[PDB]
Amino acid sequence: VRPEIKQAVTVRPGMCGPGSLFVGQLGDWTWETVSAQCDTDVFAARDASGNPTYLAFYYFRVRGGRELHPGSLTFGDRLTVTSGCYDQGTESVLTLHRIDRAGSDDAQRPLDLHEFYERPRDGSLYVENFNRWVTRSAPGSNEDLVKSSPPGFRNDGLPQLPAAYSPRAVYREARTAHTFRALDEPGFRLLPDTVEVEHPVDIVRDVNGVGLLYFASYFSMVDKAALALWRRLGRSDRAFLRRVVVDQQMCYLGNADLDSVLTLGARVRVSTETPGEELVDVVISDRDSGRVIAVSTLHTQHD
């Protein structure tokens, strides 16, 4: 058994705010955690062949609550972070992070699958990162990525996930339904208002260090769709900045060439039980290749 990684974190400018910095930090922590627990340098990974292999983001969840959500975090906040990986075979790995306020009751507690999957606590942030090793099929192409595994990836002795907690069932349902919250879920009503935004890939902002669309830029693009729909509903920019995201799920179905024009579609369901509570679904399409490259659902509270 490789130990879980606990760290004390003082919130820095580069990991908070209304943008994608927090997600970017979470992803860096996933690569550090897999590197420590799977005896592999994820940052410099190469397949047996010698080609770079990327531990690509595939399913990403951030679950908080009114007591602690990503927008709670300001400069200098003291957090505790507990991280660990779970066996998903040789081509994929699940990494969990729990984030608590430092000196909160039982912040030293270890990872608990039952807590993450069945009894999440309002006041902790729960992060699930399901990642898949991929290589490019052609240099300079971001399409048709190929499954891989770096030589010496040690998934053996990683703790096991029970069948109930499978991220594969979760993301399979999202690719089919274009939501992580089934449309027949009681207590919601679909608004007739939707948006469809043409988004050229932003080569200034959203390209990563290996020439793919940057995983955190998917969260920026989803929020661009969400803001477009917020504005179409006649709500204020000021109010968008006060929006509380208590849960968000993202599936990365594909990457995209850097000259692509993407389409960002957004729809919303409002709670009939709780004022201000709504489910926003965003689908990112690459019309020219015929592909859905992302699905995201946000569970929000606003005023």
Residues found near ligand KFV in the complex (CB under 6 A): 13, 27, 54, 56-58, 132, 134, 145, 147, 208, 212, 214-215, 252-255
Residue 62 contacts by C-beta under 8 Å, 6 or more apart in sequence? Answer: 23, 26, 70, 125, 126, 127, 245, 247, 248
Closest CA to 12 of 74, 83, 103, 82: 74
Enter the DSSP assignment of 52: B
Q: Indicate which of its own copies, ligand KFV, none lies near residue 206 (CB less than 5 to 8 Å, by partner kind).
A: its own copies
Report how far apart, in Å, the C-alpha atoms of 234 and of each of 83, 148, 240 are.
41, 47, 11
Instruction: Give the whole-angstrom CA distance, residue 56 versus residue 147.
Output: 10
Residue 227 contacts by C-beta under 8 Å, 6 or more apart in sequence? Answer: 237, 240
**Quick check: helix, strand or coil at residue 109?**
coil
Nearer to its own copies, 59 or 219 (CB): 219
User: 255: annotated binding-site residue?
Assistant: yes
Q: Indicate which of ligand KFV, its own copies, none lies near residue 252 (CB less than 5 to 8 Å, by partner kind).
A: ligand KFV
Closest CB 102 distance from its own copies, rounded Å: 12
Joined together, the tokens standing for residue 303 give 């005023």
H or E segment to which residue 232 belongs = helix 215-232
Closest CB 55 distance from ligand KFV, rounded Å: 7
Nearer to ligand KFV, 145 or 282 (CB): 145
Burial class (CB within 10 angstroms; exposed 0-12, middle 13-18, buried 19+) of 81: buried
Closest CB 240 distance from its own copies, rounded Å: 6
Closest CA to 185 of 279, 301, 277: 279
Closest CB 233 distance from ligand KFV, rounded Å: 30
Nearer to its own copies, 85 or 227 (CB): 227
Instruction: Give the whole-angstrom CA distance, residue 48 versus residue 150.
Output: 7
Closest CA to 196 of 280, 256, 257, 284: 284
Question: Which residue, judged by CB position, is nearest to ligand KFV in the bound state?
Answer: 13
User: 73: annotated binding-site residue?
Assistant: no
String of b and e for 213-226 (b: at least 16 CB within 10 Å)? bbbbbbbbbbbbbb
Q: Indicate which of its own copies, ligand KFV, none lies near residue 260 (CB less than 5 to 8 Å, by partner kind).
A: none
Closest CB 217 distance from its own copies, rounded Å: 9
Nearer to ligand KFV, 107 or 256 (CB): 256
Residue linked to tokens 């397949």: 47
User: 132: annotated binding-site residue?
Assistant: yes
- Applying CB under 8 A, which residues contact its own copies? 10-14, 16-21, 24-25, 27-28, 31-32, 41, 43-45, 52, 54, 73-77, 203-211, 214-216, 220, 223-224, 227, 237-238, 240-241, 258-259
Nearer to ligand KFV, 31 or 116 (CB): 31
Q: Indicate which of ligand KFV, its own copies, none lies near residue 241 (CB less than 5 to 8 Å, by partner kind).
A: its own copies
Q: Indicate which of ligand KFV, its own copies, none lies near residue 254 (CB less than 5 to 8 Å, by partner kind).
A: ligand KFV
Q: Indicate which of its own copies, ligand KFV, none lies near residue 45 (CB less than 5 to 8 Å, by partner kind).
A: its own copies
The DSSP-derived string for 242-282 is: H-EEEEEEEEE-----TT-EEEEEEEEEEESSSTTEEEEEE
Q: Indicate which of its own copies, ligand KFV, none lies near residue 145 (CB less than 5 to 8 Å, by partner kind).
A: ligand KFV
Nearer to ligand KFV, 253 or 258 (CB): 253
**Which residue ranges are tagged as binding site for CoA?**
57, 132, 253, 255
